[PDB]
Amino acid sequence: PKEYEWVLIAGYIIVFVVALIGNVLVCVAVWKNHHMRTVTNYFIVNLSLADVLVTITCLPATLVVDITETWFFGQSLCKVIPYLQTVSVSVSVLTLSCIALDRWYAICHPSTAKRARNSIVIIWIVSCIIMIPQAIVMECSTVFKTTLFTVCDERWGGEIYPKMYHICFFLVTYMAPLCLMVLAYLQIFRKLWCRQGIDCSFWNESYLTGSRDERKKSLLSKFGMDEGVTFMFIGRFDRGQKGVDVLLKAIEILSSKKEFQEMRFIIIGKGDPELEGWARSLEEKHGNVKVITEMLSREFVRELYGSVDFVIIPSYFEPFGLVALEAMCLGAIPIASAVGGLRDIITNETGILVKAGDPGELANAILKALELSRSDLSKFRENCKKRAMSFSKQIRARRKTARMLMVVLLVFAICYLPISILNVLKRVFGMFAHDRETVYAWFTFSHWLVYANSAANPIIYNFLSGKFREEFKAAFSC
Numbered sequence: 001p002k003e004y005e006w007v008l009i010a011g012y013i014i015v016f017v018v019a020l021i022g023n024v025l026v027c028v029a030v031w032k033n034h035h036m037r038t039v040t041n042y043f044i045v046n047l048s049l050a051d052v053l054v055t056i057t058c059l060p061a062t063l064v065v066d067i068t069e070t071w072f073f074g075q076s077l078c079k080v081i082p083y084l085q086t087v088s089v090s091v092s093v094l095t096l097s098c099i100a101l102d103r104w105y106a107i108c109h110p111s112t113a114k115r116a117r118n119s120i121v122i123i124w125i126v127s128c129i130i131m132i133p134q135a136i137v138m139e140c141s142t143v144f145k146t147t148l149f150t151v152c153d154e155r156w157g158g159e160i161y162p163k164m165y166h167i168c169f170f171l172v173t174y175m176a177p178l179c180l181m182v183l184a185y186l187q188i189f190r191k192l193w194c195r196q197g198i199d200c201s202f203w204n205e206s207y208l209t210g211s212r213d214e215r216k217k218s219l220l221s222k223f224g225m226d227e228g229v230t231f232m233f234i235g236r237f238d239r240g241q242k243g244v245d246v247l248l249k250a251i252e253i254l255s256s257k258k259e260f261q262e263m264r265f266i267i268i269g270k271g272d273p274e275l276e277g278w279a280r281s282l283e284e285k286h287g288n289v290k291v292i293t294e295m296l297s298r299e300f301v302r303e304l305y306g307s308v309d310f311v312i313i314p315s316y317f318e319p320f321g322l323v324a325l326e327a328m329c330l331g332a333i334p335i336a337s338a339v340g341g342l343r344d345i346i347t348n349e350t351g352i353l354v355k356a357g358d359p360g361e362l363a364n365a366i367l368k369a370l371e372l373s374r375s376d377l378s379k380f381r382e383n384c385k386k387r388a389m390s391f392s393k394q395i396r397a398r399r400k401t402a403r404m405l406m407v408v409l410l411v412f413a414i415c416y417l418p419i420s421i422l423n424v425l426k427r428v429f430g431m432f433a434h435d436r437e438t439v440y441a442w443f444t445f446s447h448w449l450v451y452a453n454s455a456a457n458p459i460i461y462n463f464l465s466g467k468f469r470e471e472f473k474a475a476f477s478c
């Protein structure tokens, strides 16, 4: 014995050094730089600690056993080292699960460091408890006389128990949390990439020409309106969704007031023929109200956002205030409902918030926007622009971290698939009961791969995380 031995020793050494240095540097990076202190990164630290554990205590023993096919260490270590192995695996899996859970909770339904600490502690306790059977079953057996060798292996009192235990181990440490994390991360993907975001390259002021005053003058001239504060609605005509009913009702409330003559309204969209007719009746009734049911290009809408004073977003429900972001990027000030999404983007410095379906509150907000429009609104518009850009920035960042995490999950799944399938085939379906060197080679490789995962994570952080890469950079600077 044996071929593939030098590549096994070499690979184990490489993995050992890279995993040790790498995960230690991960922990150092998070601990010494405060901007690194996020829930995700605390969890990541936990992961690296588990990896360091299994790297120090299990990897060498595994190399020796896979090389010699014997157990030189004691009975105690024959209990301990497999126990530490399984515990490390459990900690890793549950840590990934808590990461995915955290991201899902923060992204799909918009988590403190204390909560995260509790999560960590729980993870380690659960992991240590559920892996007690592993420690119980492991036994040393003497095989033969001139010599004798001892091997360390699971001792079962039947054929059913190992099958059940390894089914359970496969489900708990691999299959179920993997499935759950996949579901969570695909929902997260759909949320962050497909439903969130904004064409920042299109929705910016650079494409418009002339001052805002000139554009507004052109706007009102084109619409056949006198000068005055201009409000804009763009959503669909629904009852209980985009809230054009709230706006129409509030317009009726305002129409009796003397301030109404100072206001201008641009209501755009299709939908309920009753609401469309209501809009058209209000349009025919008042000269300072214009209704557009026809389809408008993005360029025209962009010009609108860059010309009007305020944009009214009276939604009952708005998970993604993309209209708000588009308008704010072009200097339009939002008067929106305090529903989650608009509630997220807009603050009291970057717009006006109102109760979702209260026409009185909306009319009051419109009046307030008028009195506010009696003076310079520059600072306000700039605040809106910078808030929108900041929000978009945050979305892109969340995309980066989420992609990194997904990649880690994938690499984990890949790294643990072979040993999983092998264990299930051997222990549950009783295969490999008959050419042994091939099976043994597959097993040695699978073991090495499992340990290779631990070295895989930190370099993943290096290539897919700017902050981690920068701290790694600072570390290796001699």
Ligand SMILES: Cc1ccc(-n2nccn2)c(C(=O)N2CCN(c3nc4cc(Cl)ccc4o3)CC[C@H]2C)c1
Residues within 6 Å of the ligand: 058, 061, 062, 063, 065, 081, 082, 083, 085, 086, 089, 134, 169, 173, 419, 420, 423, 447, 450
């Ligand atoms: C070496 C190694 C690495 C990873 C493994 N893995 N499978 C699934 C997840 N991870 C296994 C493995 O097949 N396990 C883990 C616990 N077991 C185990 N035997 C070990 C022997 C040595 Cl020298 C060191 C650690 C040992 O862990 C026996 C039961 C069995 C289920 C073994």
